[PDB]
Design an enzyme around this catalytic site. Structure first.
Site, PDB file in Angstrom:
ATOM      1  N   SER A 102     -17.822  28.921 -18.662  1.00  0.00           N
ATOM      2  CA  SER A 102     -18.299  30.692 -19.000  1.00  0.00           C
ATOM      3  C   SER A 102     -19.257  30.939 -18.620  1.00  0.00           C
ATOM      4  O   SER A 102     -20.277  30.598 -19.407  1.00  0.00           O
ATOM      5  CB  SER A 102     -17.481  30.846 -20.856  1.00  0.00           C
ATOM      6  N   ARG A 103     -19.738  31.661 -17.879  1.00  0.00           N
ATOM      7  CA  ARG A 103     -20.931  32.687 -17.619  1.00  0.00           C
ATOM      8  C   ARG A 103     -20.965  33.649 -18.635  1.00  0.00           C
ATOM      9  O   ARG A 103     -22.255  33.485 -18.689  1.00  0.00           O
ATOM     10  CB  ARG A 103     -20.760  33.812 -16.767  1.00  0.00           C
TER      11      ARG A 103
END
Lengths: 234, 154, 113, 194
Positions: A102-103
């Site tokens: 997840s950025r």
């Protein structure tokens, strides 16, 4: 959501729009995006609302390199791929820590979680790559192997028993600190629940503090519940 | 696309692999990809779920070890690993059944089993009661009670 | 990276970095399972030099200030060759390796050590 | 069949990982075995100062360790006691004690693989205290050379896998590109026709 494409194929082909790579017309990127960009955390000039979305995509035997999967991957702020040959290994839902990142992650957490997840990765990211070949050869390396086995055991969950965030952080702290690795492999599924039953009869003050301040309580007092339980576990 | 479109409406699917057709263990149902909505605790009970899950997991585990065997050898793998094959072979062989409508192809009248005997027999095969009976004795038999007879026949 | 473009000395100093980092890149596997002290002198000197080429890579930047307060530093191109030539000969082997972290000049490295 | 090459890719990957694991365990056990043998050398030296036997490895993937000794012992005897299960099998074939499966780094003419650490293995030909000291020294030297030969076998085995994966992966992309090109050509031909 992938079924969209199918309908969009049918009508588009019946309307005699020119084909594409796999008969998908090139508008797919537009057609998805014109929807998927609408989720946002709005500002105070218009209103303090927020919206979140979880699109779903069909895949044929895990061919992630296909057209629609790679098309949809570009838009989203992350990916959760579910892998089938691990679905029968025991971990459900079959989320793999290798393909999924997840950025935006690292910020949207209660600070109780951020203080601990690093050690969880320092066990799991090594196990999920070493186990497949290093498991056969029977101090530090075998300790890593055993710890990783107990972690991948403790992440499992039974059918439809959602847990509040506070018990999640309590058990993650219990696992990572090293107090949990004495319970044997098969009994962990019992332990993770009988802890849940123990905490309520031990006290609510920790639970209240995590609820109000969203921060880990005093470790010197946090450890006492674990210590008192381990003296009575069967 | 045709199987992909068909897969969305079934409540329970059983898959057949031509590899199982060539292996000579009929029927050719592959346990791994066969799934149903009935495998819930409130419909089949707890005596069903644990045994079914253990058999399913063992048959999934054997799949890659048998492929490793094709190159690494047969005794380079540890004895504990070899026990997985030693029991999964029997588990897969006992899945065969002698049918009643196949009398033309088999020349045999068959046998009959109720579900209680099926769960019971899988519990015994995992119990370790039949480690010394040959694998070939488990081919095309019905009730577990027949197996000890076929070994008696051999 | 060709001698006609950068000169003889800068080519040698740039290529030998990759040449000498390969020994560490390959020996890290056996290092990860057995201790270093029992190995030969070559493995020891390779580890000893590689731990400094490994940490010299870092440099504080001007944008780093808003989360790690530092003035921000710069590496001259003419001085870079002198610096790497002097390290690769072992003139700065006596400095503590982690002191080589996040800075852009060898003279400041000397001051910090 | 693209599925065939895909399955071969996964199988080769996992077998290569297993061989790499065999390599590192063999390297560690070889270092410890060499240290054990070296620590034992002075005791043989000091104690020394003051029918045919053939020995082989106990299971497969050992490389050429097994053949090079059985062949030479057989030739040198027919021209003019066995340890190891493959050694017993080599006499089960053809016709000719059977101490087997002693623990690794075991405690307390002769033809054996002599000791050198790097690559090579020398086929070599050679009162109760004297006999015990020589047989134990010989067996220790052979057990060290066995782990050396295993190290070499895994080091050779781990290489060709990567070349085979890269060439199959190239074939996989070419099969992909050909499939997509054929599919689009058929689709556009149908569209032009209709």
């Amino acid at each position: 959501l992938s079924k969209q494409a199918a309908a969009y194929r049918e009508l588009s082909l019946l309307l005699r729009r020119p084909p594409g790579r796999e008969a998908y017309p090139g508008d797919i990127f537009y057609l998805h995006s014109r929807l998927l960009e609408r989720a946002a955390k709005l500002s105070d000039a218009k209103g303090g609302g927020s919206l979140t979305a979880l699109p779903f995509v069909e895949t044929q035997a895990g061919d992630i390199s296909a057209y629609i999967p790679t098309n949809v991957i570009s838009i989203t702020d992350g990916q959760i791929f579910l892998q089938s040959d691990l679905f029968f290994s025991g971990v459900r839902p079959a989320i793999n820590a290798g393909l999924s990142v997840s950025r935006v992650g690292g910020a949207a957490q209660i600070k109780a979680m951020k203080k601990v997840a690093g050690t969880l990765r320092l066990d799991l990211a090594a196990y999920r790559e070493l186990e497949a070949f290093a498991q056969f050869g029977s101090k530090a390396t075998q300790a890593k192997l055993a710890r990783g086995a107990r972690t991948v055991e403790v992440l499992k969950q039974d059918l439809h028993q959602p847990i509040p965030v506070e018990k999640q952080v309590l058990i993650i702290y219990a696992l990572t600190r090293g107090f949990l690795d004495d319970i044997p492999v098969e009994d962990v599924r019992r332990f993770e629940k009988e802890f849940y039953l123990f905490l309520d009869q031990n006290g609510q003050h920790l639970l209240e503090h995590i609820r109000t301040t969203k921060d880990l309580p005093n470790e010197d007092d946090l450890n006492k519940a674990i210590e008192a339980f381990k003296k009575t576990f069967v | 696309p045709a199987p992909a479109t068909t897969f969305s409406h079934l409540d329970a699917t059983t898959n057949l692999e031509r590899k199982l057709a060539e292996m000579g263990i009929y029927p050719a149902v592959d346990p791994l990809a066969s799934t149903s909505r009935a495998l819930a605790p409130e419909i089949v009970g707890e005596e069903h779920y644990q045994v079914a899950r253990k058999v399913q997991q063992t048959l999934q585990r054997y799949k890659e070890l048998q492929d490793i065997i094709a190159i690494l050898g047969m005794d380079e793998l540890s004895d504990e690993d070899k026990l997985v094959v030693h029991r999964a072979r029997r588990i897969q062989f006992f899945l065969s059944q002698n049918f009643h409508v196949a009398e033309q192809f088999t020349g045999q009248p068959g046998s009959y089993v109720p579900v209680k005997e099926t769960v019971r027999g899988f519990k015994e095969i995992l119990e370790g009661k039949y480690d010394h009976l040959p694998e070939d004795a488990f081919r095309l038999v019905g009730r577990i009670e027949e197996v000890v007879e076929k070994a008696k026949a051999m | 990276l060709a001698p006609e473009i950068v000169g003889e000395e800068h080519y040698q100093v740039a290529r030998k970095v990759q040449q000498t980092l390969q020994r560490y890149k390959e020996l890290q596997d056996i290092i990860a399972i057995l201790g270093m002290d029992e190995l030969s002198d070559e493995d020891k000197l390779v580890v000893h030099r590689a731990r400094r080429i490994q940490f010299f890579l870092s440099q504080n930047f001007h944008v780093a200030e808003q989360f790690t307060g530092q003035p921000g530093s710069y590496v001259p191109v003419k001085e870079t060759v002198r610096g790497f030539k002097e390290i690769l000969e072992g003139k700065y082997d006596h400095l503590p390796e982690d002191a080589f972290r996040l800075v852009g000049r060898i003279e400041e490295v000397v001051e910090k050590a | 069949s693209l599925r065939d090459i895909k399955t071969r890719i996964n199988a080769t990957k996992k077998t290569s990982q297993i061989t790499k694991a065999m390599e590192m365990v063999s390297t560690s056990k070889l270092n410890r075995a060499e240290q054990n043998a070296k620590s034992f050398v002075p005791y043989m030296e000091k104690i020394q100062e003051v029918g045919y036997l053939v020995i082989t490895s106990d299971r497969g993937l050992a490389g050429a360790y097994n053949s090079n000794v059985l062949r030479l012992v057989y030739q040198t005897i027919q021209k003019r006691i066995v340890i190891g299960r493959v050694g017993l099998s080599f006499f089960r074939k053809r016709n000719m004690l059977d101490i087997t499966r002693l623990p690794d780094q075991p405690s307390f003419y002769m033809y054996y693989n002599h000791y050198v650490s790097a690559i090579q293995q020398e086929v070599t030909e050679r009162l109760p205290q004297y006999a015990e000291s020589l047989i134990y020294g010989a067996l220790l030297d052979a057990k060290a050379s066995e782990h050396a030969a295993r190290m070499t076998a895994m080091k050779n085995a781990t290489d060709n896998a990567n070349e085979l994966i890269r060439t199959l992966t190239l074939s996989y992309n070419r099969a992909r590109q050909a499939a997509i090109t054929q599919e689009i050509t058929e689709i556009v031909a149908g569209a032009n026709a209709l």
